[PDB]
Amino acid sequence: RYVDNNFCGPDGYPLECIKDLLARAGKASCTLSEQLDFIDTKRGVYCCREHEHEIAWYTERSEKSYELQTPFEIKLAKKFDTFNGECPNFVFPLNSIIKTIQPRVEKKKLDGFMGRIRSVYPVASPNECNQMCLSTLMKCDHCGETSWQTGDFVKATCEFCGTENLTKEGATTCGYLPQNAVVKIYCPACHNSEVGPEHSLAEYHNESGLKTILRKGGRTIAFGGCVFSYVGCHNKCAYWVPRASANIGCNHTGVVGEGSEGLNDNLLEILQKEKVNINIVGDFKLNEEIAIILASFSASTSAFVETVKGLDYKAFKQIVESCGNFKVTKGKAKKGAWNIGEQKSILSPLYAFASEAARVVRSIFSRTLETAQNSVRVLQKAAITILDGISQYSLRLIDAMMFTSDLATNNLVVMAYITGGVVQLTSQWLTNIFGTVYEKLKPVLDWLEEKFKEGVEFLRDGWEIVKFISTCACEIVGGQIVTCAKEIKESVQTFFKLVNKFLALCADSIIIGGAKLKALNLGETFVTHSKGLYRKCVKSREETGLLMPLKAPKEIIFLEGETLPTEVLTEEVVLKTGDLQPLEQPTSEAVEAPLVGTPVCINGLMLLEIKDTEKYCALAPNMMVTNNTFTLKGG
Ligand SMILES: [Zn+2]
Ligand SMILES: [Zn+2]
Ligand SMILES: [Zn+2]
Secondary structure: OOEEOOOEOOOOOEOHHHHHHHHHOOOOOOOHHHHHHHHHHOOHHHOOOOOOOOEEEEEEEOOOOHHHOOHHHEEEEEEOOOOOOOOOOOOOOOOEEEEEOOOOOOOOOOOHHHHHHHHHOOOOOHHHOEEOOEEEEEEOOOOOOEEEEEEOOOEEEOOOOOOEEEOOOOOEEEOOOOOOEEEEEEOHHHHOOOOOOOOOHHHHHHHHOOOOEEEOOEEEEEEOOEEEEEEEEEOOEEEEEEEEEEEOOOOOOOEEOOOHHHHHHHHHHHHOOOOEEEEEEOOOOEOHHHHHHHHOOOOOHHHHHHHOOOOOHHHHHHHHHOOOOEEEEEEOOOOOOEEEOOOOOOOOOOOOOOOHHHHHHHHHOOOOOOOOOOOHHHHHHHHHHHHHHHOOOHHHHHHHHHHHOOEOOOOHHHHHHHHOOHHHHHHHHHHHHHOOOOOOOHHHHHHHHHHHHHHHHHHHHHHHHHHHHHOOOOEEEOOEEEOOOOOOOHHHHHHHHHHHHHHHOOEEEEEEOOEEEEEEEOOOOEEEOOOEEEEEEEEEHHHOOOEOOOOOOOEEEEEEEOEEOOOOOOOEOEEEOOOEEEOOOOOOOOOOOOOOEEEEEEOOEEEEEEOOOOOEEEEOOOOOEEEEEEEEOOO
């Protein structure tokens, strides 16, 4: 029977043996300090004959007489200075400051629910209240793992499998106390057809059937470092509020229960500061820890979907710091800082954010798949089913994270959802490059379909492929696709090698203006080393509008494709002969920058004769300069 320095028990209430000693001594009407002086005079710890009430905790309590002490009169709790041993279970965490909600006095007459909730919080409606994040560290009977399951003080959902379990003895915690913190509990009384809404308080407790703590002062619940009381019901749900809650920094309530001592030490090192130091270690990435912290600042899931669109370090810094409770840094890991970069489990008292978006984020990145050598498409269908169950915005949220920013995760449900789309993305990617999907290119999509048969084994490779392609800067140069000068992972190198092999097999020989070029032949289109897709456009002399000599070929060859914003000095076109030689400097990569010249028709091909040099560039049907650079052997 451990007590605090005020001889009160671990539940925050007085003991019967001490009330009896004070009663027989005539000290019941005395103040707390006067009563303590008496109790200590009578040997304190040994004031009882059959008990040794070792002092385990130090608390700061109001002067109210010992008999009137409750958890609601505590302001500070810590381990007693001279207590050498492990902390027993205590209603509040150690080294915490306890806050209470002082009910407001209303001036106007209100209905039962709105009157009571508006005394607790200054809200216009229950829609302005925030459901608290309550979690319990307990075994999931459906699976066998032990983790922090999220729910309320009656039941919780296991994030790995999505099933519900009843709360059991273990470490409990409430997350960061939100504004207008409430807990919504299913109210059988309102669903019981024999009771219905507008039930009495006694009926509520009898129908609820949960194990409250019964005291002369009412029925309360102690969970996760908070003491909850019942306020009222609305929409057939019961509302509990944290009449009293601990604060260990950043408005976190800490951990109580078995094992809470070590957990609280880990929280205090990080949160027990005037300002919480959030330190991004290495490159900024939208991992689970960043997503959950940012989600904590969203009003709704859909607001978060928009918020993450194009998320970068700066936007994250500004949004998080705007509340004034955090300071965001980046660089090397620091001792005592909230170091983000190494991946850690998101199911802990830390990251226990109560926002709507945060709950969606936590669910999305915590679910597992029942993987049994299933194909990617089967896994995707399962992943989508899971994601839809979490939230109707869950797919759009992931889409935004993966395609507008830089998303990272090892969650198989998210990976399966995205990976199954690599075929559709690849089809669009090939369409963007070549204009469509050709039979010569389909083998690229057949390869992905074959890899889908590997199931989980291909999720990481597909992830990297989707990530790269989603934000790639690819261009086709002759028979090879090249990328920007970035490091390419082995899984992405493999994807591009097989794509380029299928393309090298199509590297045919074409003639443009008499010149031999190595170019892809995918059907009606071709690609040259000029870094673009072109078609052969043939028009009659009279159809071009050129001031062509009558000795020119009847048919004039143009290259239809991407062009440069160049200008033509004159409509006059020179009729000239020569041996056109392609250059390795396409797309105006030559030293010459006039971007103007005189048209010339060489072997039926229209080129612009670049001013003040001897280089030529092919013209498109619209008389704009293309990326195909030529010269003439001998001038
Ligand atoms: Zn005793
Ligand atoms: Zn489970
Ligand atoms: Zn009710």
